[PDB]
Design a binder for this molecule. Structure first.
Ligand SMILES: CC(C)C(=O)C(=O)O
Ligand SMILES: CC(C)C(=O)C(=O)O
Ligand SMILES: [Zn+2]
Ligand SMILES: [Zn+2]
Lengths: 379, 379
């Protein structure tokens, strides 16, 4: 039986990509939505960025429920690591999260340093972090641009093993920019797991540039990833982080056990939509207005039975697909109702009652016609 | 080198799920957008549905460019097949598309017939189709609900081999409802390819209920699928069909050769958006308003270089990320401009010029401040 932790990064990766970043009270509202959704951990921010974010991280750390991992992000240097720890140490379960780049391009063309120097930086930063937080505290290390570490993939194994030996309990593998295809990333995850084994938790953090973040994250589980970093409503850099709802529902549909309160999905998404001013597209998976419609029939319980993965109510929505007597499906519905009661009426009579249904609907507006009165109208 | 055909089903699967189905002139406009996008084939409709759709299919068949496959969908019965052929026979390259269910549930609980009877129906319908279209004409067979053919997967191999032997040139594998995970579907595709080999083209047709249609379609290519059925703007049943743009761009980024005019992507999507009244979400991959923004820096060419898959212009968009002197990034931009010219100004002076930039922008509205005048303002 697989353990899969859903790690939310909305307050960090999501907030920082926002056209209109959140105030402290909005961040607190979002934090509370995350707690009620029962995610397995929450990254509250990047406290080194500025004094406001520092304050927010501290407030959220103290608000955090007991036993709920509270993470904050730091770059790989002693002073910033110390500041980060100061931000979160008051949380019941603080988690230190350190990032450093590991891709060939980053090392050769951005950092312009050797691989040996990279390993030294990784080891020194994680070791230092462990020196200030003590033994009981989870440390996560992210290899930035891991998804692009193609030419230096072997190095990447060394980097993560180094991080673990220095004290990292979680190795986070980001697909910082989505460039290829899920199984390219997933094969890399598999090879990392092959050398990490039980020495650390493998986490993944995928972005959605080619519309394949959910798939990449989901398939990573089946090669050994036990944590997925996600965001509400697919917020985050560019096209966004891995969508929390799609990932949670997909894993559930595949038989996995998650702590997520699935029925909080829709009320959460609606509120996040309001807080960001980003409407929920009507065809958006899980939460889209129109995704439970089965309309194709109009052109010619069975639809609900053979063509639905999960019910509206499962994600906290009301089922709005109610048989009506006032539309393109209106006419045939009256036929079926009359059939049920054993009332025989000609095709012209049905066409008649059809018009009466749309009539007494406009009067006392709109469209709320009962079977009982429709039976009374015919006979 | 892989051959991958992009087969558009917007005028069929897309149109029939539409809240407001298209008129003949709108269908013609959509058809023309598809031709200009240079998709490899177009399914024009379901001509058996009604006389209007029949007429539309005939009009589009005659409008179709030479050498462009024009498909229309039919259920697996002689009279409907004959009607369908009548609808499309005038196209330069007509393609007959027949569907019949193949999943355990469909056969046992919906059709309530034996597997032997299913094979007979498949063979008879394809053989009949071949009898009326002649040898030169492509026949596609779809096994409806293939993605759910888990308990009877072995049967599914028999069904497709039967279809091929009867005359099917293309075997289409739909993930009618997205229920699991890409690699479950993809493994099934692989096993079908293992027995079909070079006897027919494998096509896939995935839906997007769990947000993983693009991935499922893309990964299917790497186990032998040579045709992908897609729709503009992810139109189609429920959450929609596989999104054309994401699929085309992903395959291109993975080094594949497609005929798609990539630079038609954005103008097409914008027009389809208008025709359906479904806005393009600002975080939608490829075409979303906000997906080329790199904003996270504000919180503390490189961003464009290390964090972009493809350029805005590649998909027919204008790059709107222009360095401005009027915002939260405004102040530092003036610093850098003054640095370039070797003009030294105090931190208070920069703060001053910052205010002058926002001032002469409101006057003669709005926000269009040149470097040249900003240099003239400082010195
Ligand atoms: C800090 C890391 C995980 C990051 O956000 C990226 O690589 O996408
Ligand atoms: C006709 C077939 C391909 C169909 O639309 C479905 O199975 O999704
Ligand atoms: Zn990220
Ligand atoms: Zn379909």
């Amino acid at each position: 039986p697989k353990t899969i932790h859903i790690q939310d990064v909305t307050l960090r990766d999501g907030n920082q990509a926002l056209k209109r970043p959140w105030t402290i009270d909005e961040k607190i509202e979002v934090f509370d939505l995350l707690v009620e959704l029962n995610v397995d951990g929450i990254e509250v921010g990047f406290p080194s960025s500025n004094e406001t974010e520092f304050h927010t991280c501290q407030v959220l750390s103290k608000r955090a429920p007991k036993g709920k991992p509270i993470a904050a992000l730091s770059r790989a240097n002693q002073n910033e690591i110390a500041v980060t720890w100061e931000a979160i140490q008051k949380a019941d379960c603080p988690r230190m999260h350190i990032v450093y780049p590991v891709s060939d391009f980053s090392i050769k063309h951005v950092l312009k340093i050797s691989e040996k120097e990279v390993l030294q930086k990784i080891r020194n930063s994680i070791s230092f972090a462990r020196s200030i937080v003590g033994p009981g505290i989870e440390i996560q290390f992210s290899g930035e641009h891991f998804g692009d570490a193609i030419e230096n993939f072997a190095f990447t194994k060394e980097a993560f093993l180094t991080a673990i030996e220095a004290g990292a309990n979680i190795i986070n593998l980001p697909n910082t920019v989505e460039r290829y295809r899920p199984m390219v990333f997933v094969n890399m995850v598999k090879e990392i797991k092959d050398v990490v084994k039980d020495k650390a938790i493998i986490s993944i953090h995928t972005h959605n540039d080619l519309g394949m973040a959910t798939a990449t994250s989901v398939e990573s589980v089946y090669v050994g990833a036990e944590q997925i970093e996600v965001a509400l409503n697919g917020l985050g850099e560019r096209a966004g982080n891995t969508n929390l709802y799609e990932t949670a529902i997909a894993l559930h549909q595949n038989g996995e056990n998650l702590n997520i309160n699935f029925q909080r999905i829709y009320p959460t998404a609606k509120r996040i939509s309001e807080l960001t001013g980003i409407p929920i597209g009507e065809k958006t998976p899980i939460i889209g207005e129109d995704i439970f419609s089965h309309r194709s029939g109009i052109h010619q319980h069975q639809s609900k039975g053979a063509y639905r993965t999960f019910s509206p109510e499962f994600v906290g929505r009301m089922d709005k697909e109610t048989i009506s007597f006032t539309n393109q499906s209106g006419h045939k519905a009256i036929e079926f109702l009359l059939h049920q009661r054993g009332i025989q009426v000609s095709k012209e009579g049905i066409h008649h009652l059809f018009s009466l249904a749309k009539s007494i609907s406009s009067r006392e507006n709109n469209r709320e016609i009962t079977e009982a009165e429709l039976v009374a109208l015919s006979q």
